[PDB]
């Protein structure tokens, strides 16, 4: 006969009844990419705020090719 | 039931030290006169005596086999009582939900006393109303003043006693032919020989019939220190 080691079997599913538990659509099982994007931004803000300490005090002098009303003049 | 706690060791079997030492009288006592411990060991000794005799089982009827093991053949009277008993026990820690009660089929309210407090919540959906509590006393067909749901009290009462598994077994089960101690001895020699005991209960039981301490190793088994 053939057998399966119980330690490596898969988790049993929830029973299908009138009262059924379903977590598949919640998306709360694990941290997603967005969470890791928050961590990356936090690291970035932390490094940036220390590396460039004059960023919060910018220069008001602006040239801006194609004037101020061109899209690349807002970033 | 969900309201019960964890099975005890006793819920499965009893220690052999709780076997009555006067086995000869135990096997001759009528069922109505046997206590809980006495009834446990009467059934176990007699039931295992028949089960440990393979050559006789095929020729034994289910009526006789059930009697030997102490199992009660079911009938409508006993089924009704047992069922209402188990329904009472379930309602101890469970909700009370069922079909809408009418004159033909009133809501059945089991009780031991002559009264039980009951609440009517009305029908399903929009026919459900706020809880209306009333005291359901025996002998009256109650009608909710709001939804006209009919209620009735069912009493688990029999002959100055309430309904229990023990009461149902005593009232409906009939003692058969008196247990023969020769069967105990015969089966004892079958499974217990030359220092091998394959029927421990029958080795202890035969020892008591012999007077306690007669069989090999039994004096040492009965000698305790505290």
């Amino acid at each position: 006969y053939k057998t399966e080691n119980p330690l490596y079997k898969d988790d049993e599913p929830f029973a299908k009844t009138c009262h059924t538990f379903d977590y598949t659509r919640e998306g709360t099982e694990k941290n997603g990419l967005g969470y890791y994007c928050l961590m990356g931004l936090w690291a970035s803000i932390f490094i940036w705020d220390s590396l460039y300490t004059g960023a919060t005090m910018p220069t008001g002098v602006h040239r801006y090719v194609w004037g101020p009303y061109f899209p690349t003049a807002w970033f | 039931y969900r309201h019960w706690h964890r099975m005890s060791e006793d819920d499965w079997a009893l220690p052999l030290d709780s076997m009555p030492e006067d086995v000869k009288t135990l096997m001759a006592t009528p069922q109505t006169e046997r206590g809980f411990v006495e009834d446990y060991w009467y059934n176990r000794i007699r039931g295992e005596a028949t089960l440990l005799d393979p050559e006789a089982l095929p020729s034994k009827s289910y009526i006789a086999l059930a009697r030997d093991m102490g199992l009660q053949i079911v009938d409508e009277p006993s089924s009704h009582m047992m069922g209402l008993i188990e329904l009472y026990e379930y309602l101890r820690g469970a909700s009370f939900v069922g079909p809408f009660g009418t004159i033909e089929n009133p809501v059945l309210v089991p009780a031991v006393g002559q009264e039980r407090v009951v609440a009517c919540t009305g029908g399903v959906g929009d026919e459900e109303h706020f809880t209306l509590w009333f005291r359901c006393r025996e002998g009256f067909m109650y009608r909710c003043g709001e939804c006209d749901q009919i209620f009735m009290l069912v009493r688990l009462y029999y002959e100055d006693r309430y309904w229990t598994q023990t009461l149902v077994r005593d009232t409906f089960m009939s003692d058969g032919d008196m247990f023969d101690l020769k069967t105990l001895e015969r089966v004892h020699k079958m499974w217990n020989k030359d220092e091998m005991v394959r029927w421990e209960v029958g080795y202890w039981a035969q020892d008591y019939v012999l007077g306690k301490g007669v069989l090999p190793g039994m004096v040492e088994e009965h000698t305790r220190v505290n």
Partner: protein, 141 residues
Amino acid sequence: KHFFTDGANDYVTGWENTPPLKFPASVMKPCDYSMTKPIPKHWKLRGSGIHGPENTDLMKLVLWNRLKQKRPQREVPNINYLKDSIRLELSVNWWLMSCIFLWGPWLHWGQEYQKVHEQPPWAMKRIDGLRGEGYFTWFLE
């Protein structure tokens, strides 16, 4: 899990709302009669009709929830369950390892550097003329 929950982590009584999946539906099934077909009019109500042990599935659930308490061997859970059972324990142990082999070394280096240069290696050297080690968490300054 550590905390007891009647619905999920019910270890005090071991009650389970549904039978094991191993059992065939003909042997035991979850108590669900919501799909019962309409009763013929010529049928008559014999039982109470009340939700309870008169229903076969509920009866078997109660029976099994008591007779399952004695079993010849263990029902080995899979490694996922075992990991979850001691998740906090393992994580705390790794936290201790981090505190010894990560926090320990750089904290020692900072103090040794402080001895020679008066301030930790992650701080701005002062010129005000005040004396002492000063702050340690530089990002909370």
